[PDB]
Structure 1
Amino acid sequence: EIRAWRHVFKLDPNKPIDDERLERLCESGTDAVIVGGVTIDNVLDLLARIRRFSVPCALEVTDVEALTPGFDVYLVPIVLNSRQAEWIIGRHHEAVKQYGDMMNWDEIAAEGYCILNPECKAAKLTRADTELDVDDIVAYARLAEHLYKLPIFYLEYSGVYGDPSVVDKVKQALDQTQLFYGGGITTPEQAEHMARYADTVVVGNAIYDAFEQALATVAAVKQ
């Protein structure tokens, strides 16, 4: 169950990670490892290596081409602040049309993304409106919680460390919907601060850029 996740690592399947690092990462105490791009073979190869360990393993499906059976959870982004229906339901429709019959709905959890960094690749691809004040962001969180009833609302700051006060304000609006935070977490203090408000804190880039610090984020959140 995702509700228990407090710290998760996110691995880029196009980025290499040696076996000794993968071991240290998977046995670090993190609650889950998310594979997030991407080819189907590389996704399967990485999964097989993770399965050496007992850590829950999830796939974040950003493109149907890399959709792979065998994961514990399928995290499905909905870009709530996108200007294009494509990134809100369109691509989802295409994927569900083709693969819906083989999907186990118990393993699928939608993530109501609110992409907040304009300089990020995700923002540009999805045509996200990042010019948002806290009230805008709060409105999205409330939509996720009450109207769409998504399992997850996800504040995505990508390569920048977000505003902890915004994360705190969003949390107040949420309840049944879980609050995920991602963005520029490199130090344990950064991890700890966001973890005070976010249900679940996601650590990605630091894995490749500052591995030892990335490992330290676990205890900072979980202790």
Structure 2
Amino acid sequence: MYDVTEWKHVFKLDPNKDLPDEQLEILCESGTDAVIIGGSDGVTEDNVLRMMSKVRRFLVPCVLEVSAIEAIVPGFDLYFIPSVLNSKNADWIVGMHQKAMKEYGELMSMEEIVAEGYCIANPDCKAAALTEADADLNMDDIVAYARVSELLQLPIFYLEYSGVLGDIEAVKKTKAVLETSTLFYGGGIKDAETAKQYAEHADVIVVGNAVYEDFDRALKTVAAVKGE
């Protein structure tokens, strides 16, 4: 019953960090379309489990973006499973996913799962290092990864720039080739202005790091794209 093609904004929270309960509550009731519990690396099941319990009470859909088999926790409304399409190591595309299925096939069949075709386009971030992504891409390299996602009919193509604003032109061209995939963009969105700019091309903008750096400023990204 969760339709990402109707979404416009999502906050991505890092279970490795701590947020005041007051802020976590404010983010869940902010009007964002989803609260995603992310991770990238070093995540632990206990932090994920505490966060699940803290966000589940709210009406907003809570999503667990799976980044480690040890950190799959029941209780979330949805599960996003990333596949790093430009990874140079099969583990981040399919390998870890096969081990998870082998180990938790049953737990996996009982949840709503959505695969995300990730394209990590910032060569200098923790995510690119970890996943051995060939992240130094020209725009047509990115557009081609988007075409690959559209061909596999991955519900989500996520252009990931991490802590930097990505080339807006690459967001506009990616969007132009996606006909079924929902385009998620994440990267340097810290306020109303940037939020509004990227929301012009992405189907969904992801605001994450900013919540920890300047909370009040990051909160305005919601009204910035859903407001009057």
Runs of 5+ in structure 2 lacking a partner? none
> Shift of the alpha carbon at 1:119?
1.1
* Partner in structure 1 of residue 88 of structure 2: 83
Instruction: Tell me the distance in 1 between the aligned counterparts of 2:139 and 2:88.
Output: 19
Counterpart selection for 2:108 from 103, 117, 139: 103
Mean alpha-carbon deviation: is it higher for 100-109 or for 49-58? 100-109
Instruction: Tell me the distance in 1 between the aligned counterparts of 2:154 and 2:111.
Output: 13
> Shift of the alpha carbon at 1:3?
1.6
Counterpart selection for 1:14 from 16, 22, 33: 16
The Cα offsets for residues 165-212 of structure 1, whole Å up to 9 and x where unpaired, read as 110000000011110000011121100111111001000001000000
* Partner in structure 1 of residue 155 of structure 2: 151
> Shift of the alpha carbon at 1:105?
6.7
The Cα offsets for residues 150-171 of structure 1, whole Å up to 9 and x where unpaired, read as 0100000001011111100000
Runs of 5+ in structure 1 lacking a partner? none
> Shift of the alpha carbon at 1:52?
2.7
Instruction: Tell me the distance in 1 between the aligned counterparts of 2:164 and 2:122.
Output: 7
Question: Which runs of structure 1 show a deviation greater than 4 angstroms over 4 or more consecutive aligned residues?
Answer: none
Instruction: Look up the SS of the partner of 1:103 in the other structure.
Output: helix
> Shift of the alpha carbon at 1:102?
2.0
TM-score where L is the length of structure 2: 0.95
* Partner in structure 2 of residue 72 of structure 1: 77
Instruction: Tell me the distance in 1 between the aligned counterparts of 2:146 and 2:19.
Output: 34
The Cα offsets for residues 60-114 of structure 1, whole Å up to 9 and x where unpaired, read as 1011110011111111110000111111101111011111122137611111001
The one-letter amino acid paired with 2:34 is A
Instruction: Look up the SS of the partner of 1:160 in the other structure.
Output: coil
> Shift of the alpha carbon at 1:42?
1.5
Instruction: Tell me the distance in 1 between the aligned counterparts of 2:224 and 2:149.
Output: 28
Instruction: Tell me the distance in 2 between the aligned counterparts of 1:51 and 1:11.
Output: 14
Sequence identity (%):
61
The one-letter amino acid paired with 2:194 is Q
> Shift of the alpha carbon at 1:17?
1.0
Instruction: Tell me the distance in 1 between the aligned counterparts of 2:214 and 2:70.
Output: 30
* Partner in structure 1 of residue 195 of structure 2: 191
Q: Tell me, yes or no, if structure 1 residue 213 matches structure 2 residue 217.
A: yes
TM-score where L is the length of structure 1: 0.97
Aligned-CA RMSD value: 1.1
